[model samples]
Target chain A: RDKYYLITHGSQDPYWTSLFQGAKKAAEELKVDLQILAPPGANDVPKQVQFIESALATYPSGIATTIPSDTAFSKSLQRANKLNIPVIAVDTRPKDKTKNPYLVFLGSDNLLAGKKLGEKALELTPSAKRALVLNPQPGHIGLEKRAYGIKTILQDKGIFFEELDVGTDPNQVQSRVKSYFKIHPETNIIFCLTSQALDPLGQMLLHPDRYDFNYQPQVYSFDKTPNTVSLIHKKLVNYVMDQQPFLMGYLSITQLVLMNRYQLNPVNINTA
Target chain B: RDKYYLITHGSQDPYWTSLFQGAKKAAEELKVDLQILAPPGANDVPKQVQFIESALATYPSGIATTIPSDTAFSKSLQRANKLNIPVIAVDTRPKDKTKNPYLVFLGSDNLLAGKKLGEKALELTPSAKRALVLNPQPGHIGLEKRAYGIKTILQDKGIFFEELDVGTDPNQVQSRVKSYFKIHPETNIIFCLTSQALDPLGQMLLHPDRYDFNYQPQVYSFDKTPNTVSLIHKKLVNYVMDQQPFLMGYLSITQLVLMNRYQLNPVNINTAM
Candidate 1:
């Protein structure tokens, strides 16, 4: 029986937890032994790195993990490569593809995804003088790519945008967005690049009076967490670009297994 | 000035209207002449086919349109080819690739994007014994591909699923979804392949008391229309895959312009963004 180790960025996050469930489902159906692990929260990158190192030492036949940071997991991944352990990346890919030669990338085409959101914003607010991109996860490559995608798409439309690193704290995200609104009142759209940023934005939408504004800025978000759906229903936010995290997990595991058994090369599964 | 014709299934839909706005912005910035045309909300095959025939008669410099139905559009697209008018497909693609010879495909990667949603449903309801997929546009190739993607992913995970066709009418969509729920009470995950079905599902979630049911199935919707987003924030829906329609329109136009000016062959820019 082949043993598969699954390491994720955070356990408490419903998104990651859901991914584990799918991964576990595949393991059970295939009758493979799979171990799932995760850090408690987003900030525990170093601990996640350590966990990967420890998993490498055990020499599992296959490993599936999320690269929380560009720098934290390269060496551990390199070690796994040396030991001939097949590693598959989900949700995000390594910045330096050469250093971490994962068999395949099974997640959203984030740059194009982000650009899509930017394009939508331009449409919704055709005469928008300016726009703000609210990025909660500062250094994560996937999130960064989303921001870059948005920039490229918006620039193509001749729209000006500024990327704001809104910290993960809900209150902090609120403050950053509100402060930007205060400074750049001309801004017609607020593009939240991840699920985390959308939650607070949804909350802010409830009390439009608090902002002393009559109209809400056209807002767009990435990923479909509970909060984003509600905002969409109420017309509080203009739209959301769902990355489909669950599929990311399911495909990651299945692709890893295929690569391990069939020696299949990595293929880019485009998810716009 | 270069003349560009904008053709779509319908220009009245908020989604398509927004797309036109994006394209207009690009046209204005690039100093190009742009005209928008559509077949007045009749997205059926024959209607789209007639629109294509009329559009070809104009002999425009460049044509940007959607291949709403594969069978209907294939022959018409071939007509455009015979007329020597460059055709660019947006939102959806024709089944017969050789018929159109489009400059490029600029729209959602329906299959992979659907797979992404299917994976999310599996994650959200891991213990779900059965799942239901609701595709409002049954025959449309893009919608069908999304349903197939979801079905394929869920089947791989050993979860049972059934595909339900909920026609575009709000009342019909609601009735169909409700009927499916009653038929497959064990279904814990419901994937709405289009935004039109989402608001009705959200209504069901809000008024669970009306149904006299204690449990509301986890809803996953496609495209982030305002209603779908509200449902997500309200926790009425577990997940949503935003196809970023605005970008689909913008890129379709930009790609169309590039193809015309540089004579670049069509490339597949199909993905979520």
Candidate 2:
């Protein structure tokens, strides 16, 4: 009786919920025993580590987990490898693949997605003087890779940009972004690497009268959430780069099942 | 010297612009002579038709255009057939495929995408007893089909819903949605078929204190603009369906070029991403 375990990075997020639901539906239809797990909430790294350890303890036939941060869960993944449990990383890939012995990664090409977004920003605001990259988590290697990609594209296009490390707290994100704009009056765009940063930016923009028209920096972010979609419609933010979350989950489980049954090695699934 | 012409449903839209950029880049890279045209805005059916007519006059080897409405552009598409120029429908498909002879149709499976959005809305607001489908362009057949798909899913789940014809006027959309909410008083979810409706809905949510607590309806819409992305982050909107407009444009050009050069028949390239 082989069972499959699907673990997600964030439990409260609607996008992740949809992904989990898709994976669960596929698991049930395929008649494979499936268990879904997640860290208690965002920023609960310790709990995520514990959950992964417990999943490893059970030694499920196969497992799929999102590498939220490269360092936080790298050790736990190593333990899963030691237990001879096959691991397929979904959503964001680990920073150092050598650190964790995951079979294959199935999700958006973070670097490419970021580069595409950067190119779009340049096209939209050709005269953009300076831009800010709002990072949700400082150490998340995947997020860093996206920021790096954005930087590479901006630099190539001769656009000046600075990366700002804004923690996941909503208030903190707002203050950091506001402060960055205040300090650097020349900033013309704020490139958010996470969905969480969009709301605060919107709130800041709500009082558009307060900000000088000359310094109104455009907002661009990754992922589609309800707010982001609405903002895009409102012409508040320029555009959003959607790395289809539902497809990410659907493909991850299907890939894992195929790998387990046919003894096939994992393959990289590019979202872009 | 085979050449292709790309006419999008909406050119001014950032999504369409990004997509056209991709298609243009691809055309340049492949050295495929391509001409790109778009309706001034998303719902300008007449402008789209005129553009199609003008493109057909040039008699390009291949023409790809988004079907904004079934009947509005049907005749122009037929002209393409008479001229013997291959036409590829991108984004939205025409209602009468036989009448609208396009060599291939490439875009999102809107019906399936709508169904997926319906399912996700159910999960987010399980207790929502009734819902409303916001149709930006009421008579547009493609939007009608999308709304129908959403209605079917909600109806099957025993959820009551009504389609509100909200024109592209942003203020009108807001008023109509609010009026529907006021009359029904029981509606819990507003399924917006276009990104346009999402903004007005967000305006309503920005000051939720003004509206009755019970009247607060969860919003689900298609496409991701910066404002909607921020709304989702704020938890104002329940969820959003991303159609990946950039890829839609990129693939349209690629497919049109292939079909024109090889005389390849239409393929079902409808995908979520």
Candidate 3:
């Protein structure tokens, strides 16, 4: 009865993979379809914006996407407005939107979500100091919010951090951070902003040849992507904050489908 | 290594059926387990409270539940606190809390959620003169909040309603409403709160003895149970407001797993839309 576009950060993070499973489950019950597309990583705000723009061309029943950049999505979201497709904000909230408003936000408020992540990181490593935050993008409201939350805890509790504007690519983040790790080996904790960094970070940790740490840094993740689960299980990563992607898919799909079929207006569903 | 008991209204409503699928999905990814439980209908605030109590007894790693009454769940919530099971609120928010608190709520804020439903009912039958809100549970916060949102539009727009304390049973809601309809035949727009009552209301129109209506009420629903969808296709039910469970299962499951894994504290995640 409906078609929804659940555009996440990227499939490389494996968080989108869990989200698709929830979307498909709802699709079967609602009897709907989706073109689950996004960038290769959660770090790519412009790529996610581009995906939303491209998903607009198909003219699906509705679109549920991650509004990473408030400015970049204005045009595409306005187009959805012009076309009258019920666009819902999934995973990331559109804090920057002024003109083109979607149905409603159907995910966690990343600021609070980030605060919770910081609380988790601290909960595990009470004595750990000096966290190296791998912030891939800035002005990206969702990720920025998390970084702020992390900084609040680290700086407040005497745990120091150096937040680098690590570029969007995997190798850029991997190589630059790897070299950074070699020199500033005093950093005891490794904190990543999202899913995209997990693989490269996890891989680098395996080879001390590249990421030579002075001490075994406590690695913590904000999103529990499929790749990160094994890391958490094997105790490679000490802690992870899971912003439930499945709910993002299920509720976003339900919001659009219900709105289109039965005139269901979107509600503010803040599930992490 | 986590197990969460996701206690809701009940399995009979079939809302939990869809929700459990996502719970299983997350469990597979994170390697966790869930026990989905609830009473038969939303009317049972005490039953939902009791489910929380019984779930706590099992000594599960964490629990997710429906909080219908703030008072009803307060004691059991305190019990969960003492146990430290990392209890999460699923469908309903713990508005009635004084001393007791769960880790986080993973559902919609009920009042606004009902407004979303109102938009749906209005879209289908903009001209639907009056609505008959079949609110099964009077005190239940989540379901009642939704009905409240519906009435705001219906009454505000001059589309008045008679919100009857219809019993939880479908046949009772159906037969009771059928006889009442003959008397107050002015009821033009009909709405059932959730899954329990949607069926019997649809059936009443079939028989001469049951429903002798002067005019038809543009039918609408709160939850889209399998029974309600066919009614929608047949043009019997004009609109529906869905609060599907896939999110509840997935979010609650992830919270417990993450909390157990990373020492993450409970974050209230209100997923409505």
Candidate 4:
């Protein structure tokens, strides 16, 4: 039975959605049984663990998963290893590779992606000496590391940026964003770390509640969602940094197929 | 002497500049003595009065002038009447002709011109649901009135727009406009009220000072300077509302010649496009 299981952190962060579509495309080409599992919600590490444990028990031909928040699901990887199921990490790398050492890592280098996005925002607002950054979750390694990449580039160019933790609730994100702007109107740029923040920020534009500032600062973001695409087309957005999730998902299964069927070790595929 | 005089506010204003050219064209054809006078800048009422007084002293057979103020030059105009010299106003006309009257008002209907500009931008951006306006000079009535006209159509169609004053200097206009887009990056349609802001916005696209935003909004402008025309030809700017200045100028003088030589008053000309 040519069976392969693919799992990710959420349904589709738009990027992951495209990435998964890539996986399905390859599975169809190889005629392998491919099951794609993802949590209905985002960054649900425990749900990801459950997905990994379940895939392990089914005796799949190969397994693929994105790292679940600082490598919380390594034990499942260890379990899959004992069962001799080949695994590859599709999006994020595990912090500790020994136990969850997927044969290879394929996806965006978030830090580098953030760096380029930072430069993009600066390019959009070259006259500004300061900016605002939306750090939704301070410790979410994927986004935080990306933010780190952005700060590095911005700092190097002598542009300073301040960060605010925009909580998960869309309403809170909206209010907090407006308040910050109202107080520090001088801050002319806002770097959105992900679509979760980017989409909500767009909401604040339509229904400001009170502070829908007319002079929109250059909004630069990570990943492209249809909403963002529409905004950019409408001239509301300036830049979207894409890590090419489609190619990552496509190659993740390709690496697995080559490993299990041809008995070959695949080199790293950085689909950034 | 069978001479005529044409007076305006400025040199660089493309509409006025073009109108003057048209006047020159008509003068060359009719072989009448034609003199053009204008202030070095816009809204210089005293200079316009000075020009009228000088032309009156020469006892020109006929006269044409844009209203420099509500009635600032009315006394000179009455003096022309006492001398039996016919007068017509070109370009901007007085809000109320009772105080500062002219035989004929020949120029663009800017309100309609602005409305047409909005229509052109909609045709260019067939899919846009919203837009932005760069009201370079908020209180500058001539350009400001056109913005009102553009809104009349844009609002009727449910298309929303945001406004920002892109001050007059080309460099400041460039910097401030880029900053606005960087902040409100969602704006894709910019209705440039005049060339002051329009020309610099085009410049920002090429060298974007670091954050020159991409996928520029459809730009709408007024008149056809070589720079604006070149940008439109290159597809950088989408639409330019022309006031048909050549015709305005040509007729501003033609009407005067007709009155002095043939004893006829011409119909009001509406050069709206």
How well docked is model 1, in DockQ terms? 0.04
> Which segments of candidate 4 are over 4 A away from where they belong?
A206-211, B1-273
- After best superposition, candidate 1 residue A79: deviation in angstroms? 0.6
Output the TM-score of candidate 4.
0.49
Q: How well does candidate 2 match the true structure in TM-score terms?
A: 0.51
Query: What local lDDT score does residue B69 receive in model 2, on the 0 to 100 scale?
Result: 73
Error of 1 at B265 (Å): 79
For model 3, the DockQ equals: 0.01
Better of 2 and 3 by DockQ: 2
List clash counts for every candidate, in order: 33, 19, 8, 17
lDDT of each: 0.72, 0.74, 0.70, 0.73
Cα lDDT for residue B170, candidate 1:
45
Which candidate has the top score in DockQ? 2
Quality of model 3 by C-alpha lDDT: 0.70
TM-score of chain B of each: 0.90, 0.89, 0.87, 0.86
Candidate 4 global Cα RMSD = 22.6
Worst 10 residues of 2 chain B by lDDT: B206-215
> Could you tell me how far off, in angstroms, the CA of residue B116 lies in candidate 2 after the best superposition?
33
